Structure 1
């Protein structure tokens, strides 16, 4: 019983080739280089999901910090005032407010500024 390989190697090879579509030259043509690039690309994608979670936080912090310095308050004290006033809002939504709703963002800063903590 001589089992002969055909359509088994080609199908699993073409899957890797399909994944590595849009690469530079031989990186999409040859199966070997395509397989290496897909594995490396998967590693990159894994690492950059974690790094995206951190980098977008940093960007929101930067935007919020800037929005506060125009009014004379700093980020380091704004978050402290937020905690003492029990207000719980993401820096993402706060930055979205300062870019989309200047009046309501200014309302939040006014309350945290001076109103009695709790």
Structure 2
């Protein structure tokens, strides 16, 4: 018996087309170009799911160091004071949120100087 592949091809092609939306030119009409765009976007997102956390960590370091320089103490000295003695388990991101609430990070500053 001759067997056709009608529904399965259409359903898979429509699903793959639906998987991407918001492309430029004829990158959302053809199945082939849509698959290419999905592959590239997925690989880029795979690398991003690590590069974003790297960049966010760098940004947190930058924004902590900004206030640290404003107070007059270098970032390395502050981390040494946190590590060498006065043991504290404080994420480098949490300290940033303490800067948006005044008198908290200032309290940490007045504490670490002991």
- TM-score, structure 1 normalization: 0.88
Unaligned runs of 5+ in 2: none
Tell whether the 8 Å contact from 2:65 to 2:74 is kept in structure 1 after alignment.
Answer: yes
What is the aligned partner in structure 2 of residue 72 from structure 1? Answer: 72
Tell whether the 8 Å contact from 1:63 to 1:95 is kept in structure 2 after alignment.
Answer: no
Deviations 1:78-105 (A, max 9, x none): 0000112344344444443343212010
Q: Distance in 1 between matches of 2:55 and 2:112?
A: 27
Shift of 1:25: 2.2
- TM-score, structure 2 normalization: 0.90
Unaligned runs of 5+ in 1: none
Q: Distance in 1 between matches of 2:89 and 2:109?
A: 12
Indicate yes or no: 2:104 matched with 1:104: yes
Name the SS of the counterpart of 2:24 in structure 1.
coil
Tell whether the 8 Å contact from 2:86 to 2:112 is kept in structure 1 after alignment.
Answer: no
Q: Distance in 2 between matches of 1:57 and 1:93?
A: 7
Q: Distance in 1 between matches of 2:103 and 2:19?
A: 48
Tell whether the 8 Å contact from 1:68 to 1:75 is kept in structure 2 after alignment.
Answer: yes
Q: Distance in 2 between matches of 1:57 and 1:97?
A: 14
Tell whether the 8 Å contact from 2:63 to 2:96 is kept in structure 1 after alignment.
Answer: no
Q: Distance in 1 between matches of 2:14 and 2:88?
A: 51
Note closer, same or farther for the CA distance 1:93–1:47 as it changes in structure 2 (3 Å cut). Answer: closer
- Cα RMSD, aligned residues only: 1.5
Note closer, same or farther for the CA distance 1:34–1:45 as it changes in structure 2 (3 Å cut). Answer: same
